[PDB]
Design a protein around this ligand. Structure first.
Ligand SMILES: O=c1[nH]c2cc(C(F)(F)F)c(N3CCOCC3)cc2n(CP(=O)(O)O)c1=O
Ligand SMILES: CCCCCCCCCCCCCCCC
Ligand SMILES: CCCCCCCCCCCCCC
Ligand SMILES: CCCCCCCCCC
Ligand SMILES: CCCCCCCCCC
Ligand SMILES: CCCCCCCCC
Ligand SMILES: CCCCCCCC
Lengths: 101, 124, 49, 151, 49, 49, 28
């Protein structure tokens, strides 16, 4: 029969009193016979409780924000020159033309 | 988005508008002969029909490379009618009915490029 | 050498290399705890590096 | 140093970095120990939305299984990169000195050998993801210039 | 500009990234050991890939 | 450990620190001054001629 | 340096500009 632990934690040896908390506590004190759950195998736990072979391996991984597609703008070709340059070119274009006339 | 077929539908709007002026000028040429030198109006008609048929040849060629075969089917029967003009090379009432359908066909298909292009650009 | 090849893709199946111990021997209750201590201390990772 | 990486406020990861005598992990611990912004989150979900809101500025360090589930079974705006730093392992337990350890251990090794645990993992982590696997075939980075750049 | 950016820096990517990807392209002939753990594992495999 | 490890910045980290530099009129104004100077000189010799 | 989708767009834009210029130089 499957039942969830009331504490909702895995628990370890408390620093004040030598009492195991969580699922490992109910196992040592005889409150449970099997604890099938994600439980990291450590030294302090195995020293008091029995463990089986690891049914799943893991490790400390890195999680970063997924870079989006970054769709460039419609006028992306106007990036190498600033907006001030493009306008100054047009005003210099008409200025040279009027002077040439 | 930005696809090769979306750009082909954009060049059609600029080119099909020029085909509209040709079929309109043809009706004006037919109306002038109906009211009534005569070789001038007919020779000018021969110079106008050649670009109208060659421009439509690009419409059947641009969409062929654009993989838009659902639009090619709307232009193949138009190109097949051009073959009858080149194979054979009263007539006033026949040419009048053979020109009013051109204005309606070149306009109804013109609105397709005005809408099928939007069905691809904003659909990114 | 000459490092002309490389590894690509993740591990498909994950099995472990365990330290053997005779059945009737009483060394399992010691080697298990010792291996767990060495794994928690980060010594196996440094030895592999 | 442009991206600040943090871990759980009180967890096994913080205790591991505090006792890691590795030059690769030592410099990371001294950086995370002194930092003006918050480099430690109490709830793993609060750190998750912090990564999604940082947009390439906060790299959360969590376990592999929780990272793969939060990437697949959630709206995938973040991804997992790189291999595992350390090596751990789950496992079902049994009271000290009980007759339910031998046959139980043999059943775990039998299930892991017959390819059952790999099937159950691929079903609950990939076959039931939130955003799914959109375009499973990874689109190679085209070196050529796209059309939208000169549109 | 793009041709100058090409010859400046090179970015060679691997033709494959995982085992589930090469099983669909089927363009690279991959081989395993004759008799061992890999052959026995690929023999009795329930997954489709 | 006490001088280089406990440092605020890193030499190996900020090696390149390259960023996309968008050009502006701050460094291009050198050719605009000559452009107007050429027009003023051309209008001057035109009036003298 | 240019994707195959751009090379197909340049040729048809070239012929398009050419036929547009020819049509403009015809009404006159
Ligand atoms: O025995 C333990 N089992 C654990 C199992 C899990 C998981 F199964 F992944 F949920 C996690 N998480 C991984 C990342 O942080 C959020 C939850 C931590 C565990 N911890 C460390 P604690 O929760 O700080 O005690 C244990 O000590
Ligand atoms: C004076 C007006 C200048 C307008 C400049 C608009 C630039 C927009 C660039 C991004 C476009 C995205 C659709
Ligand atoms: C943008 C297109 C405008 C077309 C305007 C046409 C005006 C025609 C006036 C003369 C009509 C004569 C009919 C016999
Ligand atoms: C950036 C908005 C203004 C772009 C002007 C482009 C002008 C090109 C010809 C000088
Ligand atoms: C897209 C199916 C039809 C292809 C016709 C090619 C000629
Ligand atoms: C400059 C001419 C480029 C022609 C490209 C034709 C398709 C590959
Ligand atoms: C906002 C700038 C508009 C420029 C239009 C084209 C001028 C030659």
């Amino acid at each position: 029969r499957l039942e969830i632990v009331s504490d909702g934690k895995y628990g370890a040896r408390d620093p004040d009193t030598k009492a195991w908390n969580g699922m490992v506590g109910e196992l040592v004190y005889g409150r449970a016979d099997v604890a099938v759950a994600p439980l990291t195998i450590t030294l302090v736990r195995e020293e008091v409780i029995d463990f089986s072979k690891p049914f799943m391996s893991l490790g400390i991984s890195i999680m970063i924000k997924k870079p989006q597609k970054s769709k460039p703008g419609v006028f992306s070709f106007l990036d190498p020159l600033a907006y001030e340059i493009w306008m100054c070119i047009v005003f210099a274009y008409i200025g040279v033309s009027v002077v040439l006339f | 988005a930005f696809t090769f077929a979306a750009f082909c539908y954009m060049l059609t709007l600029v080119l099909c508008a020029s085909l509209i002026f040709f079929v309109i000028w043809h009706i004006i040429a037919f109306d002038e002969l109906r009211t009534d030198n005569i070789e001038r109006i007919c020779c000018l008609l021969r110079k106008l029909v050649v670009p109208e048929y060659s421009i439509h040849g690009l419409f059947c060629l641009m969409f062929l490379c654009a993989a838009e075969w659902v639009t090619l089917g709307l232009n193949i029967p138009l190109l097949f009618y051009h073959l009858w003009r080149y194979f054979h090379r009263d007539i006033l009432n026949y040419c009048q009915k053979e020109s009013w359908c051109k204005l309606a066909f070149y306009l109804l298909s013109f609105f397709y490029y005005l809408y099928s292009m939007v069905y691809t650009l904003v659909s990114f | 050498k000459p490092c002309d090849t490389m590894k690509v893709g993740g591990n498909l199946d994950s099995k472990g290399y365990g330290i053997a111990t005779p059945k009737g021997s009483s060394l399992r209750n010691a080697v298990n705890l010792a291996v767990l201590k060495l794994n928690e201390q980060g010594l196996l990772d440094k030895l592999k590096n | 140093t442009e991206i600040a990486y943090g871990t759980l406020e009180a967890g096994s990861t913080k205790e591991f970095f505090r006792r890691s005598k590795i030059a690769v992990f030592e410099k990371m611990w001294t950086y995370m120990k002194s930092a003006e912004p918050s480099v430690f989150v109490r709830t793993t979900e609060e750190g998750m939305i912090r990564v999604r809101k940082s947009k390439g500025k906060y790299a959360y360090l969590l376990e592999s299984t929780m990272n793969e589930y939060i990437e697949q079974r959630k709206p995938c705006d973040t991804m997992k990169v790189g291999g595992n730093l350390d090596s751990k392992g789950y496992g079902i337990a049994t009271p000290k000195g009980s007759a339910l350890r031998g046959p139980v251990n043999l059943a775990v090794l039998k299930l892991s050998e017959q390819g059952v645990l790999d099937k159950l993992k691929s079903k609950w982590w990939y076959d039931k993801g939130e955003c799914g696997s959109k375009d499973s075939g990874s689109k190679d980075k085209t070196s050529a210039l796209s059309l939208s750049n000169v549109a | 500009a793009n041709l100058a950016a090409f010859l400046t820096v090179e970015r060679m990517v691997s033709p494959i990234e995982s085992a589930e990807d090469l099983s669909k392209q089927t363009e690279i002939a991959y081989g395993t050991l004759d008799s061992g753990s890999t052959k026995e594992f690929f023999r009795r495999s329930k997954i489709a890939v | 450990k006490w001088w280089y490890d406990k440092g605020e910045c890193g030499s190996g980290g900020g090696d390149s620190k390259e960023k996309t530099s968008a050009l502006s009129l701050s460094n291009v104004a050198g050719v605009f001054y000559i452009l107007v100077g050429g027009l003023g000189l051309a209008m001057l010799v035109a009036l003298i001629e | 340096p240019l994707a195959y989708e751009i090379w197909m767009c340049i040729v048809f834009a070239y012929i398009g500009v050419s036929v547009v210029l020819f049509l403009v130089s015809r009404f006159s």
